[PDB]
């Protein structure tokens, strides 16, 4: 990985780029014929929002997702990981990948509400004052439809709307 640093001495600014130790993919993949890191390790349809060890390898130090041309993912799995990272931040599973706070900012104390499987952003969601009749009920989304083909070990399929 590359890093950039700025050192100011004598009212003169100098900018340099220095390489750093870079992690290497583990050897002997199970499926060398796979196209992206997911099928090469037989992980397709086998991860969820809570599998942070898998999700951390595809995000930046501040919680942002990495490009697809870098990771090598397929558009189908890059969208899944991009959505599972959104729900991991919201559930409090990535406390070391927080946004960068500019100098002179102290986040205010806000109601701590525990949550998981949060599809939508809290602030952009309005309350359901009218549930509606039984045949036209306004459901509450739970999870993500992108994870609907995931491996289910039960007879009841993933319910995405409560």
């Amino acid at each position: 990985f590359r890093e950039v640093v700025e050192t100011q001495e004598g009212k003169t600014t100098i900018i340099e780029g220095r390489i750093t130790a870079t992690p290497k993919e583990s050897p002997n993949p199970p499926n060398p014929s796979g196209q992206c890191p997911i099928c090469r390790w037989n992980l397709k349809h086998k991860y969820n929002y809570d599998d942070v060890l898998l999700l951390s390898q595809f995000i930046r130090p501040h919680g942002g997702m990495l490009p697809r041309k870098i990771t090598g993912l397929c558009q189908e799995e890059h969208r899944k990981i991009e959505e599972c990272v959104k729900m991991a931040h919201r559930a409090g599973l990535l406390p070391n990948h927080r946004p960068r706070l500019p100098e002179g900012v102290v986040p205010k104390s806000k109601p701590q509400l525990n949550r998981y499987l949060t599809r939508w952003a809290p602030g952009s969601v309005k309350p359901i004052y009218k549930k509606g009749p039984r045949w036209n009920r306004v459901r509450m989304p739970v999870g993500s439809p992108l994870l609907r083909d995931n491996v289910c070990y039960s007879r009841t399929p993933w319910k995405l709307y409560h």
């Binding site: 199970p30 037989n42 992980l43 898998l54």
Partner: peptide, 8 residues
């Protein structure tokens, strides 16, 4: 040390 059907 990984078989063809190994899943992390």
């Amino acid at each position: 040390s990984y078989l063809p059907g190994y899943v992390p």
